[PDB]
Amino acid sequence: SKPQPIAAANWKSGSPSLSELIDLFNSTSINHDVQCVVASTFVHLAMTKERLSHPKFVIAAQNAGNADALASLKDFGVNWIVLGHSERRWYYGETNEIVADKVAAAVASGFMVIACIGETLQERESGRTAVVVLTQIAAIAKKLKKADWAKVVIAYEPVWAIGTGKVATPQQAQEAHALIRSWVSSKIGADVAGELRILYGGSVNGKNARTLYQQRDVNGFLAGLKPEFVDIIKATQ
């Protein structure tokens, strides 16, 4: 059977609606085992933490790369972090090795890490998805020991599905997630691969999420911080 699913809301920009939305989340009865996550930029962490009280939810930081900042986050009671998201790589210039170093530093500091990987439109079209995605995960694995994988979650997000309204088909998601899991099974261990959560993100919505969740190798979602996130939670069963 599948490991515990995750539904993660990733607040990257802009305006904080933040109060009524958290009201919605706090008032929501969740009838199954699922870890919910709300990630935000540093300046919004204090507001989210004070308002969000639902015990199935945890707060996550994003992008921290300095040991002292990681320590401070932990001290504030933040235990999750999102690293390697699309724009980090294609805009900000975080290389596979920079993301890998951040993952290792965060695991060493006591975090649960959602590490993002995924290919561009051109890589997909040219048949390079596998080498690109597997090279991204390989870079992360090189900096980790086997026991560290208890603290890692992988989010597969095709760059061409992010903000474009073009979601991956259930077949596309499944094929990518199975490929990632197969590599983990071969390079790290079948035991690790069986327990690993691999989340899909890129134009997930309230209508399409449940179908994606039915695929063998999909263990949840990275989605936006929006009211329909409640339906994305429900889609994980």
XYZ file of N, CA and C in Angstrom:
711
model
N 0.840 -1.225 0.000
C 0.000 0.000 0.000
C 0.859 1.252 0.000
N 0.197 2.385 -0.184
C 0.898 3.645 -0.308
C 1.305 4.116 1.060
N 2.414 4.869 1.133
C 2.764 5.523 2.404
C 1.781 6.685 2.682
N 1.900 7.323 3.845
C 1.036 8.455 4.203
C 1.121 9.533 3.095
N -0.029 9.959 2.515
C 0.048 11.043 1.502
C 0.362 12.409 2.155
N 0.809 13.338 1.313
C 1.029 14.717 1.691
C 0.271 15.635 0.750
N -0.343 16.684 1.309
C -0.920 17.739 0.477
C -0.246 19.030 0.966
N 0.496 19.691 0.074
C 1.301 20.855 0.473
C 0.830 22.047 -0.335
N 0.515 23.144 0.358
C 0.158 24.429 -0.261
C 1.384 25.327 -0.224
N 1.750 25.895 -1.365
C 3.033 26.589 -1.502
C 2.767 28.045 -1.868
N 2.823 28.915 -0.855
C 2.533 30.339 -1.002
C 3.828 31.086 -1.371
N 3.950 31.450 -2.653
C 5.172 32.060 -3.202
C 5.059 33.588 -3.406
N 3.836 34.062 -3.674
C 3.477 35.493 -3.859
C 1.933 35.559 -3.860
N 1.277 36.723 -3.944
C 1.631 37.930 -3.261
C 0.630 38.020 -2.108
N -0.378 38.882 -2.254
C -1.107 39.472 -1.109
C -1.684 38.515 -0.060
N -1.419 38.805 1.236
C -2.021 38.121 2.391
C -3.470 38.549 2.673
N -7.054 38.114 2.592
C -7.530 36.773 2.235
C -6.887 35.644 3.054
N -5.744 35.916 3.674
C -5.022 34.893 4.438
C -5.802 34.444 5.690
N -6.575 35.347 6.295
C -7.354 35.019 7.496
C -8.604 34.148 7.265
N -9.438 34.510 6.291
C -10.637 33.719 5.951
C -10.294 32.317 5.411
N -9.171 32.236 4.698
C -8.681 30.995 4.122
C -8.221 30.023 5.210
N -7.559 30.575 6.221
C -7.038 29.768 7.330
C -8.229 29.324 8.193
N -9.239 30.189 8.290
C -10.527 29.840 8.909
C -11.094 28.612 8.226
N -11.102 28.613 6.889
C -11.590 27.479 6.146
C -10.795 26.229 6.508
N -9.459 26.335 6.479
C -8.604 25.180 6.813
C -8.862 24.699 8.245
N -8.879 25.621 9.207
C -9.074 25.222 10.616
C -10.416 24.520 10.862
N -11.448 24.908 10.099
C -12.806 24.375 10.266
C -13.048 23.054 9.520
N -12.053 22.611 8.760
C -12.176 21.450 7.890
C -11.830 20.156 8.628
N -12.809 19.265 8.724
C -12.569 17.915 9.223
C -11.993 17.086 8.098
N -10.854 16.477 8.380
C -10.151 15.625 7.433
C -10.269 14.197 7.924
N -10.926 13.376 7.114
C -11.365 12.025 7.497
C -10.409 10.885 7.151
N -9.153 11.209 6.905
C -8.172 10.173 6.609
C -6.759 10.628 7.004
N -5.806 9.696 6.992
C -4.435 10.023 7.322
C -3.749 10.748 6.152
N -3.423 12.016 6.364
C -2.694 12.805 5.345
C -1.949 13.900 6.088
N -0.684 14.129 5.739
C 0.090 15.261 6.283
C -0.151 16.490 5.430
N -0.720 17.536 6.022
C -0.944 18.791 5.289
C 0.195 19.762 5.623
N 0.596 20.550 4.633
C 1.710 21.474 4.788
C 1.333 22.826 4.191
N 1.623 23.914 4.898
C 1.515 25.246 4.288
C 2.904 25.891 4.310
N 3.489 26.063 3.116
C 4.802 26.698 2.980
C 4.626 28.168 2.628
N 5.508 29.024 3.143
C 5.448 30.441 2.800
C 6.813 31.086 2.842
N 6.896 32.297 2.294
C 8.132 33.045 2.406
C 8.325 33.425 3.874
N 9.567 33.751 4.207
C 9.959 34.052 5.590
C 9.075 35.066 6.337
N 8.696 36.150 5.659
C 7.920 37.234 6.264
C 6.476 36.889 6.653
N 5.968 35.768 6.136
C 4.596 35.326 6.393
C 4.527 34.170 7.391
N 5.683 33.619 7.759
C 5.725 32.446 8.652
C 5.065 32.704 10.015
N 5.327 33.864 10.612
C 4.737 34.193 11.912
C 3.202 34.289 11.884
N 2.640 34.928 10.858
C 1.180 35.004 10.741
C 0.528 33.625 10.531
N 1.094 32.822 9.629
C 0.556 31.488 9.359
C 0.589 30.637 10.627
N 1.749 30.580 11.266
C 1.939 29.838 12.516
C 0.932 30.197 13.636
N 0.625 31.479 13.789
C -0.293 31.911 14.843
C -1.741 31.574 14.530
N -2.066 31.547 13.245
C -3.453 31.396 12.848
C -3.820 29.957 12.574
N -2.884 29.214 11.991
C -3.175 27.842 11.564
C -3.050 26.946 12.809
N -4.147 26.315 13.228
C -4.096 25.484 14.451
C -4.507 24.020 14.180
N -4.888 23.739 12.949
C -5.336 22.379 12.629
C -4.147 21.414 12.812
N -4.326 20.367 13.645
C -3.134 19.539 13.981
C -2.642 18.648 12.857
N -3.423 18.511 11.774
C -2.904 17.775 10.596
C -2.007 18.644 9.699
N -1.856 19.933 10.049
C -1.069 20.870 9.255
C 0.236 21.178 9.986
N 1.278 21.341 9.179
C 2.553 21.893 9.626
C 2.902 23.085 8.741
N 3.658 24.030 9.299
C 4.217 25.167 8.578
C 5.591 24.790 7.973
N 5.877 25.254 6.756
C 7.155 25.011 6.084
C 7.744 26.347 5.652
N 9.067 26.455 5.776
C 9.857 27.551 5.196
C 10.132 27.195 3.735
N 10.751 28.127 3.003
C 11.225 27.853 1.647
C 12.631 28.398 1.523
N 13.463 27.671 0.766
C 14.691 28.223 0.160
C 15.881 28.574 1.076
N 15.734 28.399 2.393
C 16.832 28.765 3.306
C 18.073 27.920 3.012
N 19.231 28.536 3.040
C 20.487 27.887 2.661
C 21.633 28.171 3.598
N 21.354 28.884 4.677
C 22.387 29.270 5.636
C 22.119 28.507 6.917
N 23.168 27.886 7.461
C 23.055 27.074 8.678
C 22.435 27.832 9.859
N 22.817 29.091 10.034
C 22.259 29.907 11.105
C 20.778 30.214 10.895
N 20.387 30.498 9.657
C 18.978 30.718 9.387
C 18.152 29.446 9.626
N 18.690 28.293 9.237
C 18.045 27.009 9.472
C 17.881 26.767 10.979
N 18.931 27.040 11.750
C 18.837 26.891 13.197
C 17.745 27.797 13.768
N 17.630 29.016 13.246
C 16.671 29.976 13.788
C 15.244 29.530 13.466
N 15.051 29.025 12.249
C 13.774 28.481 11.837
C 13.334 27.355 12.771
N 14.250 26.422 13.037
C 13.949 25.298 13.931
C 13.551 25.795 15.325
N 14.268 26.795 15.818
C 14.021 27.357 17.148
C 12.630 27.971 17.234
N 12.171 28.542 16.116
C 10.845 29.178 15.997
C 9.738 28.132 15.886
N 10.135 26.866 15.771
C 9.196 25.763 15.672
C 8.790 25.420 14.256
N 9.659 25.761 13.298
C 9.450 25.357 11.901
C 10.330 24.150 11.571
N 9.696 23.057 11.149
C 10.345 21.757 11.016
C 10.363 21.207 9.606
N 9.694 21.916 8.694
C 9.590 21.520 7.270
C 10.132 22.632 6.399
N 10.646 22.261 5.235
C 11.135 23.267 4.263
C 10.962 22.762 2.844
N 10.686 23.672 1.915
C 10.582 23.349 0.468
C 11.835 23.890 -0.198
N 12.505 23.031 -0.978
C 13.749 23.402 -1.645
C 13.711 23.009 -3.092
N 14.417 23.788 -3.905
C 14.584 23.426 -5.331
C 13.432 23.715 -6.271
N 12.424 24.474 -5.811
C 11.285 24.818 -6.675
C 11.718 25.447 -7.989
N 10.913 25.210 -9.026
C 11.257 25.566 -10.414
C 12.058 26.865 -10.592
N 11.473 27.996 -10.165
C 12.122 29.300 -10.373
C 13.480 29.443 -9.705
N 13.697 28.698 -8.617
C 15.015 28.672 -7.954
C 16.072 28.277 -8.953
N 15.730 27.278 -9.768
C 16.638 26.777 -10.757
C 16.694 27.691 -11.987
N 15.562 27.956 -12.649
C 15.613 28.640 -13.966
C 15.767 30.178 -13.919
N 15.527 30.781 -12.749
C 15.617 32.248 -12.645
C 16.759 32.595 -11.728
N 16.671 32.082 -10.493
C 17.651 32.446 -9.466
C 19.013 31.772 -9.649
N 19.062 30.688 -10.420
C 20.315 30.056 -10.785
C 20.854 29.026 -9.812
N 19.961 28.424 -9.026
C 20.319 27.306 -8.146
C 20.567 26.082 -9.009
N 21.820 25.643 -9.043
C 22.249 24.445 -9.778
C 21.828 23.172 -9.044
N 21.955 22.019 -9.706
C 21.637 20.747 -9.029
C 22.404 20.597 -7.710
N 23.656 21.059 -7.712
C 24.553 20.941 -6.560
C 24.211 21.935 -5.435
N 23.824 23.160 -5.794
C 23.327 24.135 -4.810
C 22.081 23.570 -4.119
N 21.123 23.055 -4.890
C 19.891 22.493 -4.276
C 20.261 21.318 -3.379
N 21.112 20.422 -3.877
C 21.614 19.291 -3.079
C 22.263 19.705 -1.760
N 23.134 20.708 -1.788
C 23.732 21.231 -0.564
C 22.685 21.771 0.396
N 21.679 22.472 -0.138
C 20.610 22.978 0.733
C 19.806 21.844 1.380
N 19.518 20.809 0.597
C 18.799 19.637 1.122
C 19.577 18.983 2.275
N 20.858 18.718 2.055
C 21.713 18.128 3.073
C 21.786 18.985 4.332
N 21.969 20.297 4.164
C 22.086 21.206 5.305
C 20.783 21.193 6.115
N 19.644 21.134 5.414
C 18.356 21.172 6.097
C 18.110 19.855 6.842
N 18.444 18.742 6.192
C 18.287 17.432 6.867
C 19.175 17.384 8.137
N 20.407 17.880 8.021
C 21.375 17.932 9.136
C 20.875 18.804 10.293
N 20.085 19.826 9.969
C 19.524 20.755 10.955
C 18.216 20.260 11.567
N 17.775 19.072 11.158
C 16.558 18.480 11.700
C 15.255 18.732 10.963
N 15.303 19.030 9.659
C 14.077 19.320 8.922
C 13.552 18.103 8.163
N 12.235 18.088 7.960
C 11.612 17.326 6.873
C 11.756 18.196 5.622
N 12.231 17.619 4.517
C 12.470 18.369 3.297
C 11.578 17.904 2.131
N 10.865 18.851 1.505
C 10.227 18.604 0.205
C 11.168 19.163 -0.853
N 11.831 18.244 -1.569
C 12.797 18.597 -2.612
C 12.130 18.482 -3.973
N 12.168 19.578 -4.728
C 11.508 19.649 -6.026
C 12.454 19.336 -7.188
N 11.938 18.553 -8.129
C 12.650 18.222 -9.359
C 11.672 18.267 -10.540
N 12.207 18.297 -11.755
C 11.332 18.370 -12.923
C 12.005 18.949 -14.148
N 11.484 18.605 -15.309
C 12.126 19.006 -16.576
C 11.397 20.173 -17.253
N 12.109 20.848 -18.159
C 11.520 21.912 -18.966
C 10.730 21.380 -20.157
N 9.966 22.268 -20.777
C 9.248 21.926 -21.998
C 10.176 21.336 -23.083
N 11.310 21.987 -23.310
C 12.249 21.550 -24.357
C 12.835 20.164 -24.033
N 13.133 19.925 -22.757
C 13.657 18.630 -22.313
C 12.629 17.515 -22.519
N 11.374 17.804 -22.182
C 10.263 16.879 -22.427
C 10.142 16.557 -23.921
N 10.040 17.600 -24.741
C 9.848 17.407 -26.197
C 10.985 16.608 -26.841
N 12.207 16.789 -26.325
C 13.421 16.205 -26.933
C 13.754 14.795 -26.388
N 12.933 14.305 -25.461
C 13.093 12.959 -24.916
C 14.101 12.929 -23.779
N 14.367 14.093 -23.192
C 15.387 14.208 -22.139
C 14.848 14.243 -20.728
N 13.546 14.035 -20.567
C 12.969 14.044 -19.206
C 13.714 13.149 -18.211
N 13.899 11.874 -18.564
C 14.567 10.914 -17.649
C 15.992 11.318 -17.241
N 16.861 11.610 -18.206
C 18.211 12.008 -17.829
C 18.207 13.299 -16.991
N 17.330 14.257 -17.312
C 17.290 15.527 -16.560
C 16.829 15.299 -15.119
N 15.691 14.625 -14.958
C 15.070 14.390 -13.636
C 15.970 13.510 -12.753
N 16.481 12.440 -13.361
C 17.317 11.502 -12.602
C 18.648 12.152 -12.216
N 19.182 13.025 -13.075
C 20.408 13.743 -12.720
C 20.112 14.726 -11.549
N 18.920 15.322 -11.528
C 18.592 16.206 -10.412
C 18.507 15.464 -9.074
N 17.862 14.296 -9.069
C 17.754 13.480 -7.839
C 19.088 12.852 -7.447
N 19.878 12.468 -8.456
C 21.208 11.907 -8.189
C 22.075 12.892 -7.431
N 21.946 14.188 -7.747
C 22.775 15.214 -7.111
C 22.414 15.303 -5.628
N 21.113 15.195 -5.348
C 20.619 15.227 -3.972
C 21.115 13.978 -3.215
N 20.968 12.796 -3.821
C 21.362 11.534 -3.196
C 22.851 11.480 -2.824
N 23.702 12.088 -3.665
C 25.169 12.111 -3.461
C 25.537 12.790 -2.138
N 24.666 13.666 -1.651
C 24.958 14.407 -0.424
C 24.259 13.835 0.803
N 23.515 12.745 0.618
C 22.734 12.153 1.705
C 23.197 10.745 2.033
N 22.955 10.316 3.268
C 23.142 8.902 3.610
C 21.775 8.207 3.591
N 21.775 6.881 3.529
C 20.524 6.130 3.398
C 19.495 6.523 4.470
N 19.930 6.621 5.726
C 18.980 6.949 6.807
C 18.306 8.329 6.665
N 18.932 9.231 5.901
C 18.399 10.583 5.685
C 17.105 10.604 4.893
N 16.858 9.557 4.115
C 15.654 9.509 3.285
C 14.324 9.456 4.049
N 14.352 9.047 5.326
C 13.185 9.170 6.219
C 12.734 10.640 6.325
N 13.646 11.581 6.048
C 13.346 13.012 6.150
C 13.097 13.716 4.805
N 13.078 12.951 3.719
C 12.948 13.526 2.388
C 11.614 13.149 1.758
N 11.080 14.117 1.032
C 9.890 13.934 0.188
C 10.299 14.501 -1.157
N 9.950 13.813 -2.246
C 10.236 14.375 -3.574
C 8.962 14.964 -4.178
N 9.049 16.175 -4.741
C 7.934 16.759 -5.512
C 8.363 16.808 -6.965
N 7.693 16.039 -7.805
C 7.949 16.101 -9.249
C 7.013 17.129 -9.858
N 7.571 18.170 -10.468
C 6.747 19.182 -11.125
C 7.342 19.521 -12.494
N 6.664 19.113 -13.580
C 7.199 19.490 -14.920
C 7.103 21.007 -15.029
N 8.182 21.674 -15.456
C 8.160 23.152 -15.506
C 7.047 23.662 -16.437
N 6.756 22.887 -17.483
C 5.731 23.233 -18.445
C 4.292 23.161 -17.900
N 4.140 22.580 -16.713
C 2.843 22.477 -16.047
C 2.659 23.527 -14.945
N 3.719 24.288 -14.663
C 3.653 25.252 -13.567
C 3.160 26.610 -14.060
N 2.004 27.030 -13.551
C 1.387 28.324 -13.910
C 0.847 28.484 -15.321
N 0.832 27.399 -16.088
C 0.468 27.404 -17.505
C -0.966 26.918 -17.726
N -1.551 26.315 -16.690
C -2.826 25.597 -16.785
C -2.807 24.292 -17.568
N -1.623 23.839 -17.966
C -1.456 22.528 -18.594
C -0.991 21.515 -17.542
N -1.924 20.779 -16.960
C -1.585 19.722 -16.012
C -1.057 18.492 -16.781
N -0.162 17.731 -16.146
C 0.234 16.416 -16.667
C -0.986 15.505 -16.703
N -1.081 14.656 -17.724
C -2.122 13.629 -17.731
C -1.800 12.626 -16.625
N -2.804 11.858 -16.164
C -2.513 10.805 -15.188
C -1.382 9.886 -15.668
N -1.355 9.553 -16.972
C -0.293 8.711 -17.554
C 1.073 9.354 -17.443
N 1.168 10.640 -17.804
C 2.444 11.375 -17.693
C 2.938 11.411 -16.250
N 2.057 11.751 -15.308
C 2.471 11.778 -13.905
C 2.977 10.412 -13.447
N 2.186 9.387 -13.715
C 2.529 8.040 -13.297
C 3.871 7.578 -13.855
N 4.091 7.831 -15.138
C 5.305 7.390 -15.783
C 6.531 8.058 -15.159
N 6.401 9.350 -14.859
C 7.503 10.070 -14.225
C 7.738 9.575 -12.803
N 6.667 9.413 -12.039
C 6.816 8.985 -10.646
C 7.376 7.562 -10.561
N 6.941 6.684 -11.467
C 7.461 5.314 -11.475
C 8.960 5.316 -11.798
N 9.383 6.200 -12.705
C 10.793 6.298 -13.105
C 11.672 6.717 -11.932
N 11.233 7.766 -11.232
C 11.900 8.230 -10.017
C 11.964 7.117 -8.950
N 10.860 6.405 -8.742
C 10.834 5.388 -7.707
C 11.757 4.217 -8.061
N 11.783 3.881 -9.340
C 12.635 2.799 -9.827
C 14.113 3.120 -9.588
N 14.495 4.381 -9.814
C 15.878 4.830 -9.624
C 16.219 4.766 -8.127
N 15.314 5.248 -7.275
C 15.522 5.175 -5.825
C 15.667 3.726 -5.356
N 14.818 2.854 -5.895
C 14.865 1.444 -5.538
C 16.222 0.841 -5.899
N 16.721 1.150 -7.095
C 17.996 0.609 -7.586
C 19.224 1.216 -6.920
N 19.209 2.533 -6.722
C 20.392 3.228 -6.197
C 20.473 3.374 -4.683
N 19.316 3.418 -4.021
C 19.270 3.642 -2.573
C 18.774 2.413 -1.800
N 17.718 1.782 -2.308
C 17.156 0.580 -1.716
C 15.648 0.496 -1.915
N 15.149 -0.737 -2.075
C 13.706 -1.001 -2.219
C 12.949 -0.586 -0.971
N 13.596 -0.711 0.186
C 12.953 -0.313 1.430
C 12.665 1.195 1.434
N 13.676 1.982 1.085
C 13.541 3.445 0.942
C 12.508 3.784 -0.134
N 12.607 3.134 -1.300
C 11.666 3.460 -2.376
C 10.200 3.229 -1.973
N 9.943 2.163 -1.212
C 8.569 1.832 -0.804
C 7.929 2.882 0.103
N 8.759 3.544 0.903
C 8.274 4.506 1.929
C 8.295 5.952 1.426
N 8.981 6.177 0.312
C 9.203 7.527 -0.199
C 7.907 8.137 -0.696
N 7.562 9.333 -0.206
C 6.456 10.055 -0.870
C 6.983 10.827 -2.083
N 6.299 10.631 -3.198
C 6.581 11.377 -4.428
C 5.277 12.128 -4.781
N 5.312 13.457 -4.633
C 4.154 14.323 -4.896
C 4.195 14.863 -6.312
N 3.011 15.064 -6.891
C 2.905 15.716 -8.205
C 2.506 17.211 -7.993
N 3.101 18.119 -8.773
C 2.588 19.501 -8.813
C 2.708 20.063 -10.210
N 1.932 21.111 -10.490
C 1.863 21.749 -11.824
C 0.418 21.706 -12.308
N -0.286 22.808 -12.026
C -1.685 22.985 -12.428
C -2.664 21.951 -11.835
N -2.357 21.458 -10.629
C -3.328 20.662 -9.873
C -4.487 21.548 -9.422
N -5.690 21.035 -9.577
C -6.822 21.750 -9.035
C -7.797 20.825 -8.386
N -8.883 21.431 -7.915
C -9.903 20.722 -7.170
C -10.579 19.669 -8.010
N -10.679 19.916 -9.316
C -11.327 18.974 -10.225
C -10.437 17.813 -10.674
N -9.136 18.054 -10.929
C -8.231 17.032 -11.491
C -7.418 16.173 -10.504
N -7.405 16.595 -9.248
C -6.493 15.975 -8.260
C -6.851 14.515 -7.936
N -8.133 14.231 -7.781
C -8.535 12.878 -7.358
C -8.136 11.825 -8.408
N -8.278 12.173 -9.689
C -7.894 11.244 -10.750
C -6.367 10.977 -10.689
N -5.582 12.035 -10.525
C -4.129 11.857 -10.430
C -3.755 10.965 -9.243
N -4.481 11.138 -8.136
C -4.147 10.396 -6.925
C -4.383 8.908 -7.119
N -5.250 8.529 -8.042
C -5.485 7.098 -8.249
C -4.279 6.325 -8.837
N -3.307 7.031 -9.421
C -2.139 6.365 -10.006
C -1.248 5.729 -8.940
N -0.656 4.581 -9.297
C 0.168 3.746 -8.376
C 1.235 4.528 -7.620
N 1.950 5.410 -8.323
C 3.139 6.042 -7.724
C 2.994 7.496 -7.287
N 1.748 7.975 -7.231
C 1.449 9.342 -6.790
C 1.048 9.380 -5.307
N 1.803 10.133 -4.480
C 1.528 10.125 -3.035
C 1.046 11.474 -2.512
N 0.545 12.309 -3.411
C 0.020 13.603 -3.017
C 0.422 14.724 -3.938
N 0.370 15.949 -3.406
C 0.386 17.139 -4.269
C 1.108 18.316 -3.682
N 1.735 19.073 -4.575
C 2.152 20.439 -4.249
C 1.248 21.372 -5.066
N 0.555 22.268 -4.366
C -0.493 23.081 -4.953
C -0.414 24.507 -4.421
N -1.288 25.385 -4.900
C -1.326 26.776 -4.407
C -2.079 26.924 -3.097
N -1.873 28.063 -2.438
C -2.569 28.397 -1.210
C -3.857 29.100 -1.634
N -4.912 28.307 -1.817
C -6.190 28.766 -2.358
C -7.295 27.958 -1.676
N -8.545 28.459 -1.687
C -9.660 27.689 -1.123
C -9.806 26.251 -1.665
N -9.496 26.038 -2.943
C -9.662 24.689 -3.527
C -8.650 23.670 -2.967
N -7.679 24.156 -2.195
C -6.749 23.250 -1.513
C -7.481 22.228 -0.637
N -8.627 22.639 -0.072
C -9.443 21.693 0.699
C -9.847 20.489 -0.160
N -10.168 20.721 -1.449
C -10.558 19.615 -2.340
C -9.347 18.767 -2.733
N -8.194 19.399 -2.804
C -6.941 18.672 -3.062
C -6.576 17.734 -1.880
N -6.740 18.238 -0.649
C -6.663 17.383 0.546
C -7.617 16.180 0.455
N -8.883 16.450 0.130
C -9.909 15.393 -0.015
C -9.536 14.386 -1.105
N -8.827 14.843 -2.133
C -8.445 13.956 -3.239
C -7.412 12.880 -2.862
N -6.747 13.044 -1.702
C -5.753 12.080 -1.231
C -6.395 10.988 -0.369
N -7.743 11.041 -0.309
C -8.746 9.960 -0.022
C -9.772 10.147 1.084
